[PDB]
Amino acid sequence: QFDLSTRRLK
Amino acid sequence: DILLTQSPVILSVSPGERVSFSCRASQSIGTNIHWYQQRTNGSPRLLIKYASESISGIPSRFSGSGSGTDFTLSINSVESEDIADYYCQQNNNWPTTFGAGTKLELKRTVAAPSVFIFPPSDEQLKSGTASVVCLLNNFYPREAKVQWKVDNALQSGNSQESVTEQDSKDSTYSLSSTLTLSKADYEKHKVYACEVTHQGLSSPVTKSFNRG
Amino acid sequence: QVQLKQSGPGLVQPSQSLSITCTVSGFSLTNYGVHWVRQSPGKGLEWLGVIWSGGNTDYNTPFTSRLSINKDNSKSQVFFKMNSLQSNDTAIYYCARALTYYDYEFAYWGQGTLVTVSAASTKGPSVFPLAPSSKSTSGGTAALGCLVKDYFPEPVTVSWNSGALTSGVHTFPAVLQSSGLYSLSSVVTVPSSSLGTQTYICNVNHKPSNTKVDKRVEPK
Ligand SMILES: *[C@@H]1O[C@H](CO)[C@@H](O)[C@H](O)[C@H]1NC(C)=O
C-alpha cells in the first residue's frame, strides 16, 4: 500500500 | 482494463548484486510496457520504454526485456541509490494502467544505533503538553525496541514511533520514539528514561535525564 | 529544460471540488499534450486524463462525469478540476508530459499535489526546539532537531539553514495523533564544536495553512 506521507509502498 | 501483476511485492538484495523485477499482464500487450522508479518523496522517474528501449539520463545498469504477457526490469549491479519502488505501465490498451509496484530494499552490515534523548522544551511546556523525544540514529537492520520508563514505571500506550525509509547513501534507518504526557503528569515525576534494544548492541542502551 | 510545476497541497471538503494548476516551461502546450495521473493508497497509480495540443480531452471512464481539463496556451497553464470528492479521492495528483506528442510514456512529471479530502479544518503547526546537550552529544557529534507538532493536513516541508544544511538530516514521516492532527520531528547531527559558532535553523513550511516558521535551535 502506497503511503501519501513518504510516497513509498509500506 | 489490462491488469498488471508485479512480483514479488518486496525484493531484498545486497549491493553489487543483480536483481530482476517481474511484471505480468492479464492479456498480451506486445512490448507496450514502460517502467518507473519512485524514491522517497519523489515523483515517478521513467527508466525504460517499450520493454527494452533506453531512456536518456538513466544509468546503463538498468535494462528491460520481455514481450506478450511476461516482462522483466533488471539492474545488473545494485547501488544504494537504487532503493525505491518500481512500477510497470502498459499502453497497448486504453486506458493506460499501472502495476501495483515492487519495493527494493538493500542489505548491509549490522549498524548499532546512536541514541539521543531530548527533554521537552520550556516553550512546549507553556502550551500544557510535554513531548519527550528519543532518537535512534543510523542503524541496520530496522528492527529495534524502545522502552520508556518514568520513575521506574513502565510506560505503555503513550508513545508513537516513526521510522525513516532507507538512506540512499548508507542504507541505514533512523527512528524516533516520542513519549507524550500532560504538563501536569510531567511535573509530577523526575526520572525519564529511554531504553534501546538492537541486534548491533551487546546490551541495551539507556539514555535518561532528571527533569531540571 | 522541460519542467512542470503544480499549485500547492491542500484540504478539500467532502462533496466539494478540486482545482490544480499545472504551469509548464521548456515546451509549448501547442506542441504537447499534458496528462493527469494520481496515486492513492487504495488504487495506486491511476491515469485520469489528458488535454491534447489542439484542445481535445480524454477522460478515464470512471471520471468522465466529474472531471474537466482546460488550458491557457499563452500562459502555459493547464487547469485540472474534479467535482464531488469523497475521502478516497485523497491522493497525490500529478501532471505529466510524454516523450512524443501523441504518446503516453511519461518522461516529465510535476512534483505532485497532496490533496486531502476531509471535513476537518486546516491547522498550522507549532514548532518546538530539540536542543542539543550532553544527553545528545557523543564522540564530538551532537544531535539536534525541531518538533513540528499539531498540524493538518499533510504535508509540511522542513529544511535546515535555508537549504544549506542537508547532510545528517532526517525528517521523520508524520504520525497521526489521537486528536486527528499530525506530528513530526526533524533531526540533524553536527559536530559538537560547531554549536558555538554556527546557527541552526529549521525552516518549516506548511503550505495548506500558509504557516512558515523559522525556528532557531540552541544548546540548553
Ligand atoms: C472510492 O469509492 C468509490 C465509491 O464511492 C469507488 O467506486 C472507488 O473505486 C473508490 N476509489 C478509490 C480510489 O478507492
CB spacing of C147 vs B124 below 8 angstroms: yes
For B200, the grid coordinates are: 548491533
The answer regarding whether domain B109-212 maps to CATH 2.60.40.10 reads yes
C207, C9 Cβ separation under 8 angstroms: yes
The DSSP secondary structure of C92-155, one letter per residue, reads EEEEEEESSTT---EEEE---EEEEE-SS--BPPEEEEE---GGGEETTEEEEEEEEEEEBSS-
Resolution value, angstrom units: 2.5
* Element (DSSP H or E) covering residue B122: helix B122-126
Kind of pairing between the strands at C10-12 and C113-117: parallel
Q: Is C197 exposed, middle or buried (0-12, 13-18, 19+ CB in 10 A)?
A: exposed
Rg (CA), chain B: 23
Chains A–B, number of C-beta pairs less than 8 Å apart: 18
* Per-residue b or e along A1-10, where b marks 16 or more CB atoms closer than 10 Å to that residue's CB: ebebbbbbbe
Prior bond of C208 cis (ω within 30°): no
B126, B33 Cβ separation under 8 angstroms: no
Tell me the residue type at B75.
I
Chains B–C, number of C-beta pairs less than 8 Å apart: 114
Domains and CATH numbers, chain C: 2-118 (2.60.40.10), 122-219 (2.60.40.10)
In terms of CA atoms, which chain C residue is nearest residue A8? C41
Rg (CA), chain C: 21
By residue count, chain C amounts to: 220
Q: Kindly give, in sequence order, each residue whose CB lies less than 8 Å from that of residue C36, ignoring residues fewer than 6 positions away.
A: C47, C48, C49, C50, C69, C80, C93, C94, C95, C96
Prior bond of B95 cis (ω within 30°): yes
Largest distance between two CA atoms of chain C: 65
Q: What are residue C163's phi and psi, to 5 degrees?
A: 95, -15
How was this model experimentally determined? X-ray
The terminus-to-terminus CA distance of chain A in angstroms comes to 6
Kind of pairing between the strands at B10-13 and B102-106: parallel
C26, C74 Cβ separation under 8 angstroms: no
In terms of CA atoms, which chain A residue is nearest residue B39? A8
The DSSP secondary structure of B59-95, one letter per residue, reads -TTEEEEEETTEEEEEESS--GGG-EEEEEEE-SSSS
Of B100, B121, B135, which has the smallest distance from its Cβ to C128's Cβ? B121
Nearest partner of C51 among C28, C75, C68, judged by Cα: C68
Q: What are residue C136's phi and psi, to 5 degrees?
A: -140, 15
Q: Which atom of ligand 1 is nearest to the CA of C43?
A: 13
Nearest partner of C206 among C144, C130, C127, judged by Cα: C127
What CATH class does B1-108 carry?
mainly beta
Nearest partner of B112 among B81, B144, B83, judged by Cα: B144
CB spacing of C175 vs B160 below 8 angstroms: yes
| Measured distance CA(C204)–CA(C163) in Å, rounded | 11
Which residues of chain B are in CATH 2.60.40.10 domains?
1-108, 109-212
C153, C184 Cβ separation under 8 angstroms: no
For C59, the grid coordinates are: 477522460
